[PDB]
Amino acid sequence: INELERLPANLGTYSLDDCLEFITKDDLSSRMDTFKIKALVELKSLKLLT
Amino acid sequence: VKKNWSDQEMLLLLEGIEMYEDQWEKIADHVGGHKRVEDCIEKFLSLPIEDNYIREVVGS
Amino acid sequence: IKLQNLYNWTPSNYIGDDEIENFRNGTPDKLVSDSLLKLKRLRKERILNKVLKPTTEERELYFKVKRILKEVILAKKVSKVPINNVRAFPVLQTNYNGSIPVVR
Amino acid sequence: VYICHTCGNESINVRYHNLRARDTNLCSRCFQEGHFGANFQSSDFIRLENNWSDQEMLLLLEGIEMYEDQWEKIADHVGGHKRVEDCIEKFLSLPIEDNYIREVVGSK
Amino acid sequence: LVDFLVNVQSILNAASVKCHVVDESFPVLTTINKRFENGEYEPIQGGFYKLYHDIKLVCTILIHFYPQGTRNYQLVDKFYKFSSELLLRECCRIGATELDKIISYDFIKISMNYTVPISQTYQIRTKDMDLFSSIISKSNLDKRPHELPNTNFKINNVLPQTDIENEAPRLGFVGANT
Amino acid sequence: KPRSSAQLEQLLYRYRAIQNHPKENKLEIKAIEDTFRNISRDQDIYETKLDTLRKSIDKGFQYDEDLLNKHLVALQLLEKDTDVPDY
Amino acid sequence: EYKPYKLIQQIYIFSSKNLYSQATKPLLGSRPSCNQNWVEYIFNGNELSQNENAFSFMLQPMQTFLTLQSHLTSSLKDTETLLTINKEPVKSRTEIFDIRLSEGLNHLMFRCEDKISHETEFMNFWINVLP
Ligand SMILES: [Zn+2]
C-alpha cells in the first residue's frame, strides 16, 4: 500500500500501437490511462480486503 | 555518450526491439547517441515482461 | 588519477574472481542459478523478521546476475534471446487545470 | 447514456470519470478545453468507454466503495449488461491475498 | 536518404484515408501521389522542402472551402497538424524589467525557446456575468476575417500553458476510501 | 563510499563548492579526495578486468533457451520484490 | 479587422519584486519557499491589433501579486493612463504599477487616452488565480 500510494497521480501510458491512430499534439490518445487503471484496481482491491 | 535515459530514448529502444529482435547494432543505431551493446541490452534485461507470459511460464 | 575514472563509474563495477573463473571454465548458468537461489533464500529470510531496504549482499548478487546475463547475451551465446516486453511503459502527463472558478 | 456534468450535453463515445466526486462525469471536449471546475486538476479523470476488464473491475470496486450493503446499484454503476449475480462472484473470487500469503508460507 | 521518402509516403497514404488530401489536384493539375510514383522529391533538402510546400499548398486550398465547421475542414486541419509536425521532427533528425534585473543578477539562466500558435475564444458579459465560450475551431491556415456572429462578442486570446512540468497528487489523494 | 551513481554526483557537487575557499575545512577536502582516490582504484580495476573477462571467454558453450527464460523472468521477478515460486 | 496600436507599445505583466524578495531571501532565517515559479507576460503592442484586445492566463495560488509595467512611448505627449482591476482603479507608482489579485477570476482594464487628440486604446486581461 505504501509503495502504491506514492505513484504519480498523472501516470499515463505510451504504447507502441498509438502510431496507427496518428495522435496529434492537440488530441486525446486512446488507451492513455492503462497503467493508471491497473494501479487503481490494485490499490482499491487492497483497501477492500476486509 | 550520455548515460541517463529519457522517455524518447526508452521509446526508441522499445521500437527498435519490436522491429529488430537481436540485431543490437541496429537498435543502437535507432537510439543513436548511446552505447551499442553496453547500454541497449542493460536497459533490456530491466524492461518488464508481459503478465500473461509470466503467468504461463511460472504455471507450466 | 581521477576525472574519467568517476564519470563512467557505476556501483555495479566489481567482478572479483567468480565470474572470471566461471566464464573461463564455461558453465555460467551454474552461477546465475546459484545466485538466484541465494537471492530467494535471503529474501525469505527478509520477509520473515520483517525488514525492508534489501541488504547490500542481495544488491551485489543482483548486480552479479545482471552482469553475467549481460555478458552472455553480448557475446552472442544465446540464439534468439526472448522478446517478452510489455510494449508499453509509464509516462507522465500534464495538468489541464480547471478553467472555471469554484463557488463557495 | 451518460450526461456531462459541465456542459450538460450527452457524451458521444467516451466519458471522463473523476475519482474524487465519484458521481461526476465529463465529456471528452470538456477535458481538452479543461472546462471542468477549478477545484480539480486533469490528473484524476479516467477515460472510460461509454458503450471482465480493468474498466469494469475498477467500476465494480468503486461501486463497492460508494455503496456497501446495496448490490442492485452496483450493476447500474458498471452500465449493466449481465445478471446481478455475476458481480458478487467476481468480487468473491479475486485472488488479492494469495500473492501475499505464498510469500510467507498409511491410507494407500 | 531515399529510404525515408517511402516511409513518409507510407504514413501519409495511411493517415489520409479519411482526409482525402493526397488525391486532390493542384497546379496541368497533379496530385501528391503523382509526385511519388515518378521521382520529383529528392533526398536532398530541396526535395523535403518541396514536399512540405506541396502539403501546405493542398491543405491551404482545401481549407478555403468546407467553410468553417464541417468535418471536412477539421479533418484537413488535423492532417496538416500531423504532417507538419512529422516532416519537421524527421527533417531535424535527418538533415529588461524590474524583476529580470535582480533575477539575472542572482541567477544563471539556461533558457529554451519555442513558438506556439495562439487560440481564440468568444466572450461577453450578458447582464451580470462575465462568461466566455468554447475554443473557436478556426484553423491556423485560414485567412478569412472573423464575422462576429452577434456584433457584441469580444475576442479573447487564450495563452497556452507555458509550464511544461507541473505537480500532481500522489494517488493517495485520488482514492482514500470513503 | 558512495553506493549509487547519484550519490557520487553530489559528492562532487560538494567538493566543487567547498574547494572554492580552501583552508576552512581541511578534513572535508582531504576526506573527499581520499574517497575519489579509492573510487578511481575500483573503476580502474573493473576497466582492466572487463577485457580479461572478454578475452578468457569460452567458445565451447552456448547458453540454451527454455533456461534463459527461467532466469530472465526469475530475475525480473526477484528485482520487483515479488516471489518466484519454487521450480 | 487588424489595427495595430498607435499609442501603447509594450506591456509587461510580471511578478512583483516584493513577493520575489521574500521568496528567495528568507526573513530572519526562515525556511525557503517550497518552490519558485515566475512569469513575465510581454505583449508587443505593435504586433497585436485591436478588436482582439482580450487575453487570458492562469497563475498559481502563490502568485497573488503582479506589477503591470506599462511602456507607452508612441505618444510622446501628456496622455491619460488608468487601469481598473475589478472595475476599481489603481494608481501608478514608462509607468510601474502594483496589483493585488483575489482568489477568483479577476479582470483588469488598462486604458490610455490622449488629451490633445481623442484616440482611446484599451487592453483587458483576465488572471485566473487558482484556489
Ligand atoms: Zn462537457
Curated annotation (Swiss-Prot), chain A:
It comes from the Eukaryota. It is found in: Nucleus. Present with 1990 molecules/cell in log phase SD medium. Catalytic component of the chromatin structure-remodeling complex (RSC), which is involved in transcription regulation and nucleosome positioning. RSC is responsible for the transfer of a histone octamer from a nucleosome core particle to naked DNA. The reaction requires ATP and involves an activated RSC-nucleosome intermediate. Remodeling reaction also involves DNA translocation, DNA twist and conformational change. Interacts directly with SFH1, CSE4, histones H3, H4 and H2B, and via its N-terminus, with RSC8. Interacts with LDB7, NPL6 and RTT102. Component of the two forms of the RSC complex composed of at least either RSC1 or RSC2, and ARP7, ARP9, LDB7, NPL6, RSC3, RSC30, RSC4, RSC58, RSC6, RSC8, RSC9, SFH1, STH1, HTL1 and probably RTT102. The complexes interact with histone and histone variant components of centromeric chromatin. Belongs to the SNF2/RAD54 helicase family. This is Nuclear protein STH1/NPS1. The chain holds residues 203 to 252 of 1359 of the full protein.
Swiss-Prot record, chain D:
Residues 52-99 form the SANT domain. It is found in: Nucleus. Zn(2+) binds at C4, C7, C27, C30. A zinc finger (ZZ-type) spans 1-51. It comes from the Eukaryota. Present with 3380 molecules/cell in log phase SD medium. Component of the chromatin structure-remodeling complex (RSC), which is involved in transcription regulation and nucleosome positioning. RSC is responsible for the transfer of a histone octamer from a nucleosome core particle to naked DNA. The reaction requires ATP and involves an activated RSC-nucleosome intermediate. Remodeling reaction also involves DNA translocation, DNA twist and conformational change. Dimerizes via the C-terminal coiled coil. Interacts directly with HTL1, NPL6, RSC6 and the N-terminus of STH1. Component of the two forms of the RSC complex composed of at least either RSC1 or RSC2, and ARP7, ARP9, LDB7, NPL6, RSC3, RSC30, RSC4, RSC58, RSC6, RSC8, RSC9, SFH1, STH1, HTL1 and probably RTT102. The complexes interact with histone and histone variant components of centromeric chromatin. This is Chromatin structure-remodeling complex protein RSC8. The gene is RSC8. The chain holds residues 257 to 388 of 557 of the full protein.
Swiss-Prot record, chain E:
It comes from the Eukaryota. This is Chromatin structure-remodeling complex protein RSC58. GO terms for cellular component: chromatin; nucleus; RSC-type complex. The lineage of its organism: Eukaryota, Fungi, Dikarya, Ascomycota, Saccharomycotina. Component of the chromatin structure-remodeling complex (RSC), which is involved in transcription regulation and nucleosome positioning. RSC is responsible for the transfer of a histone octamer from a nucleosome core particle to naked DNA. The reaction requires ATP and involves an activated RSC-nucleosome intermediate. Remodeling reaction also involves DNA translocation, DNA twist and conformational change. Component of the two forms of the RSC complex composed of at least either RSC1 or RSC2, and ARP7, ARP9, LDB7, NPL6, RSC3, RSC30, RSC4, RSC58, RSC6, RSC8, RSC9, SFH1, STH1, HTL1 and probably RTT102. The complexes interact with histone and histone variant components of centromeric chromatin. The chain holds residues 10 to 251 of 502 of the full protein. Its main location: nucleus. Present with 4460 molecules/cell in log phase SD medium. It is found in: Nucleus. Keywords: Bromodomain, Chromatin regulator, Nucleus, Transcription, Transcription regulation. GO terms for biological process: chromatin remodeling; nucleosome disassembly; regulation of transcription by RNA polymerase II; transcription elongation by RNA polymerase II. Residues 10-90 form the Bromo domain.
From Swiss-Prot, chain G:
GO terms for molecular function: chromatin binding; histone H4 reader activity; lysine-acetylated histone binding. GO terms for cellular component: chromatin; RSC-type complex. It comes from Saccharomyces cerevisiae (strain ATCC 204508 / S288c) (Baker's yeast). It is found in: Nucleus. Component of the two forms of the RSC complex composed of at least either RSC1 or RSC2, and ARP7, ARP9, LDB7, NPL6, RSC3, RSC30, RSC4, RSC58, RSC6, RSC8, RSC9, SFH1, STH1, HTL1 and probably RTT102. The complexes interact with histone and histone variant components of centromeric chromatin. The chain holds residues 444 to 625 of 625 of the full protein. GO terms for biological process: chromatin remodeling; nucleosome disassembly; transcription elongation by RNA polymerase II. Component of the chromatin structure remodeling complex (RSC), which is involved in transcription regulation and nucleosome positioning. RSC is responsible for the transfer of a histone octamer from a nucleosome core particle to naked DNA. The reaction requires ATP and involves an activated RSC-nucleosome intermediate. Remodeling reaction also involves DNA translocation, DNA twist and conformational change. This is Chromatin structure-remodeling complex subunit RSC4. Keywords: Bromodomain, Chromatin regulator, Nucleus, Phosphoprotein, Repeat, Transcription, Transcription regulation. The keyword Transcription regulation applies.
